Every structure is written in structure tokens, then in C-alpha cells.
């Protein structure tokens, strides 16, 4: 059993693994029923991992929201760094989509309302996440959504998953918070259809695709509701000048419950 301050964990309880972090389920050492997640360095990418976890500490100290993973404690050592965080017991959106294949528009609305709340705070603070993808949208059991993985966040060297990155980011142009809105659009599209809207054989081929095609239109199924169709077209604008801004996103009709009134749940 390893310890970080008043918290402990076994590496048997591996719950997350990225290029730049390994995450374990843990517990409070005094209150054994208090579950946590302990985010550690990935030694395969030590230098970068250390840098990113350091940055994440600094960002999350400033960010407190019900839809952003909470930071409870942290320790920074010479060759290692540890973040003690809110445990999310429902895995991530990547696992969920693999299992479900596609989500109902109602489920999408439920998750996106929560994302939108978190993003509202980022917007106010002038923070861009830059690495939004299904792997860092965490679920917790009434499914709560929490945005994680803030190591790449900046106030107004990125690597991750180019299929979720805005054209201006891929093309090494100026970007702002609207780059996160593109990412959200791609995620929403994937929840709806099971696939990313724009794919290529390689990151370089995706760049070439975005460079060549000054108008990008995602293929939205005929059966998609008018509000969701409109939202997806506006989020997935190639040129950020044309892309929906945060205000318009936050107040979009799709982010209101449909149906507005339903049955009370089965007894």
C-alpha cells in the first residue's frame, strides 16, 4: 500500500491510464469509506508527465465546479508527483460509448448541459482546456459528468487526439475558447452517430484535409432533431469566425429538456 498524505492506494486498483498519467482508486487512511482517485506520473513519459501534472495542480486550485473533478490534495517530489482527486465510479465517456454504441438525444442533452456548466466557468476565467475527448469526460453515479485532465489547459506543446482538435489548432493558427467548442461538437457527433465527424488515415492527412476544404459539413442523419442538427452545424464550423460562440452555445435551445415535461419515473 502506497500513501500520499492522509490517503492510500494499491496499484492493483488501476482505473485510468494515459500517456502522461496513471490513475488508481484509493481511500482516506482514517475514513476508509471515503474513496479517492490518485493520479500519478507515467514514467514512460516522465519529463512531460511531471510537467503536465504540475500544471494541472496549478489550474485545478483555481477551478471548483460540480462538473469539474475536484482536487483534494497533492504532493510534488523530485521524480514523482501525485494528485488526490474526486473518485468518479462510472468510468469515462469512451467506455460508455463503446458499450452503448450510440446515445439517445435525451442522454446527449443531459451530459451536454453538465459540460456546458463546467465550460461556463472556464470561459469566465479565460481558460481553454485544449484536450477535450471522451477519455477525459468522466462519469459518476443520475449519471454526473465531470471534466478531467487539465494538464494542457492554458489562460488565453499540445499532443492528444487530433480527431477532436479544432481545424485552427491542427493548422497551427490562432485559437481561443472556440477551439474547445469544436471539440465538444465532435464529441456530441460521436455520441449521436458512433463515429467522429471527420476522419483521416493519419494526423498529417487530417491536417491536409482541413487545409484543402474551406467548408466542412458533418453528415448529420435525417432522423436527427432540428435543434441538435442546428447545434452540430454551428459547433462544427471550420472557420472559427463562423463558429458559435460560448454565449450562443450556453443558451442554445437543445440544452433545454426535451420533452420539457415527461412522466414521473416508474414506481
Ligand X SMILES: CC(C)[C@@H](C)NC(=O)c1ccc2nn[nH]c2c1
Residue ranges binding ligand X (CB under 6 A): 15-18, 21, 23, 37, 39, 69, 85-88, 135-136, 138, 148-149
Please identify, using beta-carbon distances, which residue of 129 and 240 lies nearer to ligand X: 129
Is 177 among the annotated ligand-binding positions?
A: no
Under a CB-based contact definition with an 8 Å cutoff, are residues 169 and 190 in contact? no
Is 19 among the annotated ligand-binding positions?
A: yes
Under a CB-based contact definition with an 8 Å cutoff, are residues 83 and 89 in contact? no
* The three three-digit cell numbers of residue 50, written as one number: 511531471
Is 261 among the annotated ligand-binding positions?
A: no
Catalytic residue, from 131, 205, 242, 247: name it. 131
Residue 91 touches Cl ion, criterion: CB under 5 A: no
Give the residue at shortest CB distance from ligand X: 18
In the residue annotation, 13 being an active-site residue is answered as: no
Is 22 among the annotated ligand-binding positions?
A: yes
Under a CB-based contact definition with an 8 Å cutoff, are residues 188 and 231 in contact? yes
Residue 202 touches Cl ion, criterion: CB under 5 A: yes
Of ligand X, Cl ion, none, which one sits near residue 134, judging by CB under 5 to 8 A according to partner kind? none
Please identify, using beta-carbon distances, which residue of 42 and 193 lies nearer to Cl ion: 42
R_g (Cα) of the chain, nearest Å? 19
Cis preceding linkage at 233, omega within 30: no
Q: Please report how close the Cβ of residue 178 comes to ligand X at its closest, in angstroms.
A: 23
Interface segment toward Cl ion; rule CB under 5 A; list 50-58, 93-101, 136-144, 202-210: 202-210
138 DSSP β-pair partners: 92, 146
Positive or negative torsion for Cα 251, 252, 258, 261: positive
Distance CA 250, CA 260 (A): 17
Distance CA 127, CA 261 (A): 35
Q: Please report how close the Cβ of residue 150 comes to ligand X at its closest, in angstroms.
A: 8
Which residue numbers belong to the known binding site for ATP?
Answer: 15-23, 39
Residue positions annotated with a catalytic role: 131
Amino acid at each position: 500500500t502506497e500513501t500520499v498524505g492522509k490517503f492510500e492506494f494499491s496499484r492493483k486498483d488501476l482505473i485510468g491510464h494515459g500517456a502522461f498519467a496513471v490513475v488508481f482508486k484509493g481511500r482516506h487512511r482514517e475514513k476508509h469509506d471515503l474513496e479517492v482517485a490518485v493520479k500519478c506520473i507515467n514514467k514512460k513519459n516522465l519529463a512531460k508527465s511531471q510537467t503536465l501534472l504540475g500544471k494541472e495542480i496549478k489550474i485545478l486550485k483555481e477551478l471548483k465546479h460540480e462538473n469539474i473533478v475536484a482536487l483534494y490534495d497533492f504532493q510534488e517530489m523530485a521524480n514523482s508527483v501525485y494528485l488526490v482527486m474526486e473518485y468518479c465510479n462510472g468510468g469515462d465517456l469512451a467506455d460508455y460509448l463503446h458499450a452503448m454504441r450510440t446515445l439517445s438525444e435525451d442522454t446527449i442533452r443531459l451530459f451536454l448541459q453538465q459540460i456546458a456548466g463546467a465550460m461556463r466557468l472556464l470561459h469566465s476565467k479565460g481558460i481553454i482546456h485544449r484536450d477535450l475527448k471522451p477519455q477525459n469526460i468522466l462519469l459518476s453515479n443520475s449519471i454526473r459528468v465531470k471534466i478531467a485532465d487539465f494538464g494542457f489547459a492554458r489562460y488565453l506543446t499540445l499532443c492528444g487526439s487530433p480527431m477532436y482538435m479544432a481545424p485552427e489548432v491542427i493548422m497551427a493558427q490562432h485559437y481561443d475558447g472556440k477551439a474547445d467548442l469544436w471539440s465538444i461538437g465532435t464529441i456530441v457527433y460521436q455520441c449521436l452517430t458512433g463515429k467522429a465527424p471527420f476522419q483521416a488515415a493519419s494526423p498529417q492527412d487530417l491536417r491536409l484535409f482541413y487545409e484543402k476544404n474551406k467548408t466542412l459539413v458533418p453528415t448529420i442523419p435525417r432522423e436527427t432533431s432540428a435543434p441538435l442538427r442546428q447545434l452540430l452545424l454551428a459547433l462544427l464550423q471550420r472557420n472559427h469566425k463562423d463558429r458559435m460562440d460560448f454565449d450562443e452555445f450556453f443558451h442554445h435551445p437543445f440544452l433545454d429538456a426535451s420533452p420539457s415535461v415527461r412522466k414521473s419515473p416508474p414506481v
